[PDB]
Amino acid sequence: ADLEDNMETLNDNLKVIEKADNAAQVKDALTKMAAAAADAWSATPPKLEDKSPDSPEMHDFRHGFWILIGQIHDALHLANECKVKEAQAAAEQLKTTCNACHQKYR
Amino acid sequence: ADLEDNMETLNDNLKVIEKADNAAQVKDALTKMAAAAADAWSATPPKLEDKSPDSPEMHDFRHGFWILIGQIHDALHLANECKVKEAQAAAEQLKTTCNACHQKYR
Amino acid sequence: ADLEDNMETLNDNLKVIEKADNAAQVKDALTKMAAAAADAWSATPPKLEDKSPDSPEMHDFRHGFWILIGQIHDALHLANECKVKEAQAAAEQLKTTCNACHQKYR
Amino acid sequence: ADLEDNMETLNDNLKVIEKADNAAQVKDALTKMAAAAADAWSATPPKLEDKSPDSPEMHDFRHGFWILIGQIHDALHLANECKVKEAQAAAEQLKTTCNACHQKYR
Ligand code: HEM
Numbered sequence: 215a216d217l218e219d220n221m222e223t224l225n226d227n228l229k230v231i232e233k234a235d236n237a238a239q240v241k242d243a244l245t246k247m248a249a250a251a252a253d254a255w256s257a258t259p260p261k262l263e264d265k266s267p268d269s270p271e272m273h274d275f276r277h278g279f280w281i282l283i284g285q286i287h288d289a290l291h292l293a294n295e296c297k298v299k300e301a302q303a304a305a306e307q308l309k310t311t312c313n314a315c316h317q318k319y320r
Numbered sequence: 321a322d323l324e325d326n327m328e329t330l331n332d333n334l335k336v337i338e339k340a341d342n343a344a345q346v347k348d349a350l351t352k353m354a355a356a357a358a359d360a361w362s363a364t365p366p367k368l369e370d371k372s373p374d375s376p377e378m379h380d381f382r383h384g385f386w387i388l389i390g391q392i393h394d395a396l397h398l399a400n401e402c403k404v405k406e407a408q409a410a411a412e413q414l415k416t417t418c419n420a421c422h423q424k425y426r
Numbered sequence: 427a428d429l430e431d432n433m434e435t436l437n438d439n440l441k442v443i444e445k446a447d448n449a450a451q452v453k454d455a456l457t458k459m460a461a462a463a464a465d466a467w468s469a470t471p472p473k474l475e476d477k478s479p480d481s482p483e484m485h486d487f488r489h490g491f492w493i494l495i496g497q498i499h500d501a502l503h504l505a506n507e508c509k510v511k512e513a514q515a516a517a518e519q520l521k522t523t524c525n526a527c528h529q530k531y532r
Numbered sequence: 533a534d535l536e537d538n539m540e541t542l543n544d545n546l547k548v549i550e551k552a553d554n555a556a557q558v559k560d561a562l563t564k565m566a567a568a569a570a571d572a573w574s575a576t577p578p579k580l581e582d583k584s585p586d587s588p589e590m591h592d593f594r595h596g597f598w599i600l601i602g603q604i605h606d607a608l609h610l611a612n613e614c615k616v617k618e619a620q621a622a623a624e625q626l627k628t629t630c631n632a633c634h635q636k637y638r
Pocket residue numbers: 217218219221222224225228259260275276277278279282308309311312313315316319320
């Protein structure tokens with residue numbers, strides 16, 4: 215799929231987690247973020263369109279995705295453990311990653 | 321790509337790493353494995369086509385990939401650190417992950 | 427050592443990364459953060475002394491430490507890859523972890 | 533404890549996981565492994581008695597503990613999710629880590 219709406223998927227579901235009442239809602243939302251993050255692994259962003267995929271800045275662009283994927287993995291465990299406020303915070307802390315990569319590659 | 325290809329991608333580069341003389345070959349190989357593992361995230365394996373995408377086996381199916389992704393991530397760091405032998409061992413260790421998921425959903 | 431003293435160690439070093447010129451200052455600093463973070467895995471914080479180690483809340487208190495350990499582990503790879511500004515950024519992010527646990531347990 | 537005592541803690545708890553019947557015994561055991569792994573972080577092995585604890589040779593010895601800590605954190609998540617067989621498998625796999633570090637530093 216596209217990076218935007220891979221990014222939209224991530225962003226919508228992030229708010230869903232923010233407004234959630236319950237675990238079920240969070241589990242479903244995190245799973246959707248997992249799909250969009252993994253599916254975004256391929257993409258070449260607009261800033262980086264001519265740079266080589268095997269390029270030092272593509273390597274750093276993807277790394278940020280490993281970070282995100284790892285942070286979503288763990289938050290899903292917390293959700294699965296029905297530690298909701300805890301999943302919710304891990305999601306909030308997961309924001310930096312979004313931010314660090316935005317500042318640099320967008 | 322096809323679940324099948326991705327598995328072939330992982331497999332093939334696994335041997336490339338087992339065989340490698342220097343860092344560059346290991347890095348390139350790992351990176352390919354990363355692409356295949358991430359791309360495979362959304363696949364529904366043949367043994368589970370009946371069972372829903374939100375089902376318990378599917379979550380456990382997907383979890384296994386989270387583990388692979390994390391292990392590839394770290395090995396690439398070791399490769400980047402020119403610690404080749406160590407990278408090659410981290411690869412060999414991974415094989416368990418491949419095998420835990422094969423025993424179960426294969 | 428002391429929980430207080432480890433916190434100090436984490437902080438002091440955190441700043442040393444902030445004012446870094448080179449990777450070596452960063453690697454050394456992170457390695458110490460690692461020692462402090464691991465060494466504090468044990469500690470019972472003041473607000474929790476009445477609570478059993480095996481309490482749901484000393485399970486979350488410790489969880490936070492795993493997050494920090496993981497984050498440092500990864501920043502050290504970045505540093506070891508002489509990816510210095512990048513390592514610096516990973517350090518900036520991991521503050522969230524310091525703050526999530528402060529707001530709750532401190 | 534001294535490296536030896538933590539290694540025994542690790543070893544003993546691993547059989548306990550091995551023979552377990554219910555989640556509770558697995559979690560209690562993994563939590564102990566966590567303490568022993570974190571508490572070992574600082575130990576110098578004996579074949580490194582001389583080598584300064586900023587050698588890259590120390591750095592590599594500890595790296596292995598970052599790997600163990602991470603694999604324990606997870607297997608605890610699995611256990612906390614009452615996914616007991618899955619937790620048990622995650623412990624068996626994580627030995628490779630035990631085995632790798634024994635081979636090199638022991
Ligand atoms: C973190 C979980 C995260 C969020 C949230 C997020 C959101 C987001 C939006 C809303 C856009 C705009 C898309 C549009 O078409 O309107 C956007 C764009 C980009 N993102 Fe992002 N994004 C998050 C995480 C990450 C991470 C970890 C990275 C890189 C490692 C990343 C990258 C990008 C890039 C590059 C863009 C530019 C897209 C474009 O304008 O074409 N995002 N993101």
